């Protein structure tokens, strides 16, 4: 895309060891599936296009970008070794939103609704088997 947006996060790397675990399967089949289809998912389904949104400071502030489209691809590509890596990606996505935006803001309200759902689902994450 625009040279003024950063390259998106890595979703493929043959040198990175990978595994499928039951926890990772749950994160794709239950957690991501639930959040992806939520009414408020759309701002989080792809990287922030700071040029199109006219937010030239976005990637000055947010140095650790993450989005659900990247997480979806990481899960589909079996990019992760364990569930914590994936959970950390979701946490980074929510924290980016809270850092950049204000407590009033529509996108924050949306992120908070998604994060509540995420927490509920992670509380039921199965033991690794
Ligand atoms: C309002 O700024 C934004 C912040 C994040 Br994080 C995602 C989308 C946005 O529009």
Author numbering: 40 to 168
What's written in the study?
Bromodomain-containing proteins are a prominent class of epigenetic readers that recognize acetylated lysine residues, typically on histones. BRD4, a member of the bromodomain and extraterminal subfamily, which in fact contains two bromodomains, is perhaps the most widely studied family member and has been shown to be very amenable to binding druglike molecules. ATAD2 was proposed from computational druggability analysis to be less tractable than BRD4, attributed in part to it lacking the hydrophobic region present in the BRD4 ligand binding site, termed the “WPF shelf”, interactions with which are postulated to contribute significantly to ligand binding affinity. We demonstrate the utility of FragLites in mapping the binding sites of bromodomain proteins BRD4 and ATAD2 and demonstrate that FragLite mapping is comparable to a full fragment screen in identifying ligand binding sites and key interactions.
Three FragLites (FL7, 16, and 33) were identified in the orthosteric site of ATAD2 and 17 FragLites (FL5, 6, 10, 11, 12, 15, 16, 18, 19, 20, 21, 22, 24, 28, 29, 32, and 33) were observed in the BRD4 orthosteric site. Those FragLites identified in the orthosteric site of either ATAD2 or BRD4 recapitulate a key interaction made by the endogenous and known synthetic bromodomain ligands with a conserved asparagine residue (Asn1064 in ATAD2, Asn140 in BRD4). Most significantly, hydrogen bonds to the asparagine residue in the orthosteric site (Asn1064, ATAD2/Asn140, BRD4) were identified by multiple FragLites. In both ATAD2 and BRD4, while the majority (22/42) of binding events involved ligands that contacted only one molecule, a significant fraction (FL2, 4, 5, 7, 10, 11, 12, 15, 19, 21, 22, and 24 in BRD4 and FL1, 2, 6, 7, 10, 28, and 29 in ATAD2) were involved in contacts with more than one protein molecule in the lattice. As such, the hits for these FragLites may not occur in solution.
